[PDB]
């Protein structure tokens, strides 16, 4: 089940950047889909392959997923306060391409709001949560090996590797470092214990 | 006074009103952003400039921050404990305005709960705290000269100017008077020793 080639979607984001950096240092052959190349830092850890394109364009997604061993999805639309379907339409383009190229493993990040009561969502975050739910459906109904990662507040604490993962629930803390989050994303490429589960990562920092 | 023009956000609120009163008394030229339905009281001290608008509108925050030397943030939700992003989104707008207009100094109020063990946050206060956490992260990673003011319970005790300021930890009492809290927000304008630090003002009133 060895995973060497991965595609990262959302590589230029807050979590994406440290996931990409960790993935490149751990030996992964990384393909990233970016809309603008000047957002990848020109120093240190760089991906092996850059596809310049858009996750809503099925051609770009197919070019990105071709010949991978697994996909990591760290898509976000931080700015959208009103109904939005970019992530879920991106998931559809990813699901379809995974199927046409025979890639069976996807690890995708939504949010811990999908595990807590709906009344916990702040009004201005309801649209992205609604599309998070829509993307979770696309991936769950796809048949693929899909690890759902639903993190709480994403912090800037240093990497620890010591976080807890509670399977289909909510655990001790309400924070995961972006570094620890990307670590867990990459850890999910090395096991099947989270396949078809919802994972909540959190850790007590200092 | 090097600092003489300041914007106060949340000047109509419980701490903001006494902070506005002390700032005018101390000779500051104060600009306030007020929501249309909630103007400052009739008999109260008059600021030098009033912008009517909303902290969620980037245009109104830009109008308020332009031409200022420094910014004080005392936004809140009154006694409304509902999930919100008004403080974090507003801080996002304040951060953008300050960078555009060349304002560096922002003194912003979140809460002592960002210094304490997260397991101790009372569940009734977690939603508002989750936004203080979002707001603090916005301001922390802004790169601006940001004083994180993290008070415990806000009381109605007198202005003393004799409170303790604890750096990057919990202090010796669990209360600060709204008047002392506002005194400290203004004290932070006259010194750079707290820039980049978290600050916990507390006092014993007797
Ligand atoms: N902030 C939190 O505390 C928190 C908590 C729980 C869950 N989450 C969720 O976790 C996920 C990742 O979080 P994050 O903050 O790391 O994301 P982020 O910083 O907002 O980055 C979003 C990524 O998705 C890319 N993207 C957006 N639309 C795209 C499109 N049409 N085509 C290609 N790429 C696109 C972005 O590319 P560009 O650089 O071009 O924009 C970027 O790389 C998000 O969905 C977020 O809602 C966040
Ligand atoms: N024991 C405590 O009370 C305590 C302890 C620790 C920390 N804190 C936190 O300290 C901060 C200040 O506390 P406080 O009691 O002085 O505040 P407050 O009385 O709740 O006042 C909130 C201020 O922010 C304004 N505001 C709210 N939404 C706005 C919007 N969209 N646009 C523009 N202005 C808006 C409000 O204006 P309007 O008049 O229009 O409403 C008001 O002036 C709060 O964030 C609070 O959560 C409180
Ligand atoms: C901030 C955020 C979140 N945040 C959370 N999600 C789950 C649990 C806790 C939180 C939190 O913020 O504490 C979720 C989706 C999108 C967004 C963003 F960046 F777009 F605004
Ligand atoms: C009361 C409150 C607090 N309270 C505290 N915060 C920090 C430390 C101690 C306390 C306390 O009151 O014991 C925090 C945020 C918002 C709110 C409010 F007014 F909106 F309800």
Curated annotation (Swiss-Prot), chains A, B:
Positions of NADP(+) binding: 10, 12-15, 35, 38-39, 54-55, 75-76, 78, 87, 109, 132, 153-154
Activity regulation information from UniProt: Mesobiliverdin acts as a competitive inhibitor for flavin reduction, indicating that flavin and tetrapyrrole substrates compete for the same site. Inhibited by a wide range of xanthene-based drugs, such as phloxine B, erythrosin B, tamibarotene, sulfasalazine, olsalazine, febuxostat, ataluren (PTC124) and deferasirox.
EC code(s) of this entry: 1.5.1.30, 1.3.1.-, 2.6.99.-
Tissue expression notes: Predominantly expressed in liver and erythrocytes. At lower levels in heart, lung, adrenal gland and cerebrum. Expressed in adult red blood cells.
Keyword annotations of the record: Cytoplasm, NADP, Oxidoreductase, Phosphoprotein, Transferase
UniProt keyword annotation of Transferase present: yes
Record CDD domains: BVR-B_like_SDR_a
GO cellular component term, pick one: plasma membrane
Top-level taxon of origin: Eukaryota
Signal peptide extent: none
Active site as annotated: 109, 188
Assigned protein family: Belongs to the BLVRB family.
Protein name: Flavin reductase (NADPH)
Organism in which the protein naturally occurs: Homo sapiens
């Amino acid at each position: 089940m060895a995973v060497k080639k991965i595609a990262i979607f959302g590589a230029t984001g807050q979590t994406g950047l440290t996931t990409l950096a960790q993935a490149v240092q751990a030996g992964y052959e990384v393909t990233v889909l970016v809309r603008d190349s000047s957002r990848l830092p020109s120093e240190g850890p760089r991906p092996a392959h850059v596809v310049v394109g858009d996750v809503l364009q099925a051609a770009d997604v197919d070019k990105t997923v071709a010949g991978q061993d697994a996909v990591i999805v760290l898509l976000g639309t931080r700015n959208d306060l009103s109904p939005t379907t970019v992530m879920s339409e991106g998931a559809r383009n990813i699901v379809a391409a995974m199927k046409a190229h025979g890639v069976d493993k996807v690890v995708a990040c939504t949010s811990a709001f999908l595990l807590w009561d709906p009344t916990k969502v702040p009004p201005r975050l309801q649209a992205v949560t609604d599309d998070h739910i829509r993307m979770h459906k696309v991936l769950r109904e796809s048949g693929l090996k899909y690890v759902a990662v639903m993190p709480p507040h994403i912090g800037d604490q240093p990497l620890t590797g010591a976080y807890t993962v509670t399977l289909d629930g909510r655990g001790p803390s309400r924070v995961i470092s972006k570094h620890d989050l990307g670590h867990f994303m990459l850890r999910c490429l090395t096991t099947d214990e989270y396949d078809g589960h919802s994972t909540y990562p959190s850790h007590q920092y200092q």
